[PDB]
Design a protein around this nucleic acid. Structure first.
Ligand code: MG
Ligand code: MG
Ligand code: MG
Ligand code: MG
Ligand code: MG
Ligand code: MG
Ligand code: MG
Ligand code: MG
Ligand code: MG
Ligand code: MG
Ligand code: MG
Ligand code: MG
Ligand code: MG
Ligand code: MG
Ligand code: MG
Ligand code: MG
Ligand code: MG
Ligand code: MG
Ligand code: MG
Ligand code: MG
Ligand code: MG
Ligand code: MG
Ligand code: MG
Ligand code: MG
Ligand code: MG
Ligand code: MG
Ligand code: MG
Ligand code: MG
Ligand code: MG
Ligand code: MG
Ligand code: MG
Ligand code: MG
Ligand code: MG
Ligand code: MG
Ligand code: MG
Ligand code: MG
Ligand code: MG
Ligand code: MG
Ligand code: MG
Ligand code: MG
Ligand code: MG
Ligand code: MG
Ligand code: MG
Ligand code: MG
Ligand code: MG
Ligand code: MG
Ligand code: MG
Ligand code: MG
Ligand code: MG
Ligand code: MG
Ligand code: MG
Ligand code: MG
Ligand code: MG
Ligand code: MG
Ligand code: MG
Ligand code: MG
Lengths: 200, 85, 113
RNA sequence: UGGAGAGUUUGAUCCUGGCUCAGGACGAACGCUGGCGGCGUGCUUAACACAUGCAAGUCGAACGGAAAGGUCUCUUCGGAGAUACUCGAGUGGCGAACGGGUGAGUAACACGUGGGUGAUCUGCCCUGCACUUCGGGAUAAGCCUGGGAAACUGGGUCUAAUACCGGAUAGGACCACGGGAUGCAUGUCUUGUGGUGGAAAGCGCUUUAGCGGUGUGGGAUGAGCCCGCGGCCUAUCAGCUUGUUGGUGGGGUGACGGCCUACCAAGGCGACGACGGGUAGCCGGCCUGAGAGGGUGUCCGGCCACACUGGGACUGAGAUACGGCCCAGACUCCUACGGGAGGCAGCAGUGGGGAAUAUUGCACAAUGGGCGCAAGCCUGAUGCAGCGACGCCGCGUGGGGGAUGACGGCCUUCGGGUUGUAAACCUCUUUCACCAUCGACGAAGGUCCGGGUUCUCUCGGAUUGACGGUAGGUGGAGAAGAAGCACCGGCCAACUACGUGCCAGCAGCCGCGGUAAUACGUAGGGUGCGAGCGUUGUCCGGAAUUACUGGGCGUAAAGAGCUCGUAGGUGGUUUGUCGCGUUGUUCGUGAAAUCUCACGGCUUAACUGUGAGCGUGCGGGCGAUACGGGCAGACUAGAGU
């Protein structure tokens, strides 16, 4: 399943603009609904819960899928917030967002879901495909000379590209240098209140 | 029975039972004659009954009726029964 | 009789196999005496490995191979180096290899500049 | 590398201590709802009763034969020719003890782990060495007749064999005496002399067609038997035991043994729980937990037990003999009443019980097995498919703009607020479904066919896939076909209005409801999840509320009224020694899967392949001697005189 609902509504409740650029948000940054302008009780559980929601609606991950990402992140060496945001940053629909081929996250998900891409010459259509080190991310020859793929040819500049991946010229393809560590991760959220959420 | 080959094998089990029983019944009487001859204290008959009884235990063991260790244990008990006499 | 037989332990559509020395009075996926190789009939040649020094022990003591295992021993040269047939060298063939993960990755950095 | 708390005794407080809750899990069920796929999984209750079809046969290269087919076939005009490939029935061989099922019984050497077997067996398989020699009498089938309602059975003749029976010769049978090595007591192994002994079977052949037989040496494999140690409750079960405990002589078995028997002795076991009672297949594992623990034994894998109930043996290398035998019993059926038949806890299915658990499916293509020289035949094992959201995993139901904060609904302090960039509108893309088309991998093999003589080998041909015209690819059209469920007083994320008035109802706990109910019912709004979401049942967690890790007893529950003393537990200073505990190392073992880690493959994931850990242990060998203990002394401080 997906969410398939209003997107500004879950940025107002979480008090954080999750998509890139929104004029509906910042006219009302307070939570939606009819009791929205309240000064609410900030529980310790509320600060851990709403921090976990900030990552599910940034990346578009259901709860059972997001929990399995936590299962291996707590189980790998290093930290837990480092490795949870790493394996969320390695999903294919997030890689397409960081490379500039899509304006938002939800249009990055369809272009992977509708099968407009390859990775190692292999046709893929799964949005939670996790890329690894040295993975080329190619693109279908049918998907060239298409409107959403050529409307993102001239808009290659307004968003920055992170250091761990790289885009090239008119043969559009994305090269993964290594897995992203921490510093080149975009931060709307802290990474310790998610770890403290699953200890309850 | 139901399976066709178990009707066949029911017939061959009885023929093997009658064959094994007649051999084993004669071995009891061969030993029994030696036990009476060794109770007479003769050592004349009991020398040559021992040679014919131990020969019959060997031939039963070669026909698969008794086991070879069963022939060995019965020959050794009849031969030592003569050395006391 | 001691048999050298195959043991199905893959997925539903992926029959992986192990070359195992077992008894004939034994089901397929029971206790084998010893595993002496493996056989994956899903690659493009196949993926055949026999231990080939423990295979020479079990053949020299009386283990009868089944008919797929007998074909495998003829490919690996084990049945030929046991019976004295002249084809004792291994006529098995691997797939033609792929360029590795780094070599293709650098050849895209070489082509983009 | 891994540990969270909250509510509730009081007017308030601290403590003690129960109860309740939030989490995870399922062979699940029920309620509401429901798109697709991958991969698992499904009678937990009646080991209740079962209709029908299938679940074990094969060999003519063992044998006599000739009912069926194909012949050269006389020619009958539907009668022939065993000579003949081929083959029903029959004899003979091998298999049928495996595979498949179930968990009733079992508290036990049943299982787990580690040893012993100088106390044993082992068909088929591999190899070393010997041999394969004379004879004989039958009989199934056939044919002819008798009985019987049947099921079945009698007699007379007749014919074979690798069927059966008797000799010759052949040491791993036996007896006595020997040496020789060996030790762990009975002894074992190897050789010598003498005296007794025991086997066999042939068949086929295009002209390297080829398969078999018997005795013995050694392997391999499977198995039997004995022992250490480990895993429930119950003392409101405290005396059990007479083949019982030991010996001797015989018997018995593959083997040791009171396993059996006679005789002699008078023992054996028990408060470290005997004998009873209750319950239970055990384990790899699974669930939970920070661990230690607690619960569990379902899929899969191992071993065990049973096969309507009870008992027994036969055959065989091997038998709890599921689809064998015989007796007894219950139940169902047939009968001419004299007598007969049957056993789904195989697969599928029916009835019944229950909250509840599926098709009277396809295929031998793959893997494993049985028989065969072989082709082949058999295989409800297995491979797959059907059905159920039963579980897990994955993906869709749109995406980008878009204020004119439209209509409506709800609230309103009548100013507005909110649902809400959400719709509408413009626009982009079609994963899946849909239509069309192509179309597999599993098949370095199975068969025939030239070379490749053999065995082998492939140039290369022939056809062979249940799943399946499925997965997958390609094309086509259009946002088009696709969202619900619970909750919102506190724990615990999420609040107002109307209706109701201790009523109707709610509730896991404290509790809410008696006219302004954030707790009842509906509405709007909201939160948590999502093809699901709740509820009940069950287990662990929280619970340090059985406390080893990790608790207490003056007054909260808890020191026996007090002493003596049995078993038991614990023990001062010091020398030497042993190496049982302890500790180091190494070898053997701790199956596979599962689990952790790292790489690989399924488009990703679940799933799956490999490698390394883990398997906390146990046995063998070799080091260390501080501490504990044993043994052999010393000492005087404790204790006693
Ligand atoms: Mg037969
Ligand atoms: Mg008589
Ligand atoms: Mg004896
Ligand atoms: Mg309390
Ligand atoms: Mg009080
Ligand atoms: Mg109170
Ligand atoms: Mg349901
Ligand atoms: Mg329904
Ligand atoms: Mg299925
Ligand atoms: Mg049952
Ligand atoms: Mg026939
Ligand atoms: Mg034969
Ligand atoms: Mg059986
Ligand atoms: Mg004759
Ligand atoms: Mg003879
Ligand atoms: Mg002789
Ligand atoms: Mg007596
Ligand atoms: Mg005796
Ligand atoms: Mg005795
Ligand atoms: Mg029981
Ligand atoms: Mg704990
Ligand atoms: Mg089981
Ligand atoms: Mg079962
Ligand atoms: Mg029954
Ligand atoms: Mg016997
Ligand atoms: Mg049987
Ligand atoms: Mg049956
Ligand atoms: Mg059934
Ligand atoms: Mg019912
Ligand atoms: Mg088959
Ligand atoms: Mg086969
Ligand atoms: Mg199935
Ligand atoms: Mg499904
Ligand atoms: Mg298409
Ligand atoms: Mg709250
Ligand atoms: Mg009111
Ligand atoms: Mg309410
Ligand atoms: Mg799902
Ligand atoms: Mg419950
Ligand atoms: Mg509890
Ligand atoms: Mg506890
Ligand atoms: Mg206490
Ligand atoms: Mg005290
Ligand atoms: Mg008091
Ligand atoms: Mg008190
Ligand atoms: Mg006192
Ligand atoms: Mg008192
Ligand atoms: Mg004492
Ligand atoms: Mg001391
Ligand atoms: Mg002591
Ligand atoms: Mg293991
Ligand atoms: Mg992996
Ligand atoms: Mg992968
Ligand atoms: Mg695996
Ligand atoms: Mg050791
Ligand atoms: Mg004194």
């Amino acid at each position: 399943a997906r969410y398939t609902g209003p997107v500004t509504r879950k940025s107002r409740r979480l008090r954080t603009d999750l998509v890139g650029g929104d004029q509906a948000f910042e006219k009302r940054p307070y939570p939606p609904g009819q009791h929205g302008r309240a000064r609410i009780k900030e529980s310790e559980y509320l600060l851990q819960l709403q921090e976990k929601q900030k990552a599910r609606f940034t990346y578009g991950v259901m709860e059972k899928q997001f929990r399995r990402y936590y299962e291996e992140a707590v189980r790998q060496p290093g930290k837990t917030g480092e490795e949870l945001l790493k394996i969320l940053e390695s999903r294919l629909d997030n890689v397409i967002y960081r490379a500039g081929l899509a304006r938002t996250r939800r249009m990055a998900r369809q272009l992977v879901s509708h099968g407009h891409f390859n990775v190692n010459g292999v046709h893929v259509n799964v949005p939670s495909y996790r890329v690894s080190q040295y993975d080329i991310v190619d693109v279908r020859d049918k998907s060239l000379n298409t409107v959403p793929f050529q409307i993102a040819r001239e808009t290659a500049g307004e968003r920055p590209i992170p250091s761990w991946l790289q885009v090239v010229g008119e043969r559009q393809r994305v090269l993964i240098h290594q897995l992203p560590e921490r510093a080149q991760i975009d931060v709307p959220l802290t990474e310790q209140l998610i770890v403290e959420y699953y200890s309850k | 029975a139901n399976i066709k080959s178990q009707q066949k094998r029911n017939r061959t089990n009885e023929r093997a039972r009658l064959r094994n029983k007649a051999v084993k019944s004669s071995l009891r009487t061969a030993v029994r004659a030696f036990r009476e001859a060794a109770h007479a204290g003769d050592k004349a008959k009991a020398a040559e009954l021992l040679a014919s009884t131990n020969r019959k235990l060997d031939k039963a063991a070669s026909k698969g009726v008794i086991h070879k260790n069963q022939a060995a244990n019965k020959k050794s008990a009849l031969a030592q029964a003569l050395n006391k006499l | 009789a001691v048999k050298i037989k195959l043991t199905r332990l893959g997925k539903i559509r992926n029959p992986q196999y192990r070359v195992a020395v077992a008894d004939a009075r034994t089901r397929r996926d029971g206790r084998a005496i010893e595993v002496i190789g493996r056989y994956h009939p899903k690659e493009e040649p196949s993926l055949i490995e026999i231990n080939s020094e423990r295979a020479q022990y079990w053949l020299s003591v009386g283990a009868q191979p089944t008919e797929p295992v007998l074909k495998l021993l003829k490919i690996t040269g084990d049945w030929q180096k046991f019976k004295g047939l002249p084809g004792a060298q291994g006529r098995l063939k691997v797939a033609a290899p792929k360029p590795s993960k780094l070599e293709v990755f650098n050849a895209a950095l070489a082509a983009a500049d």
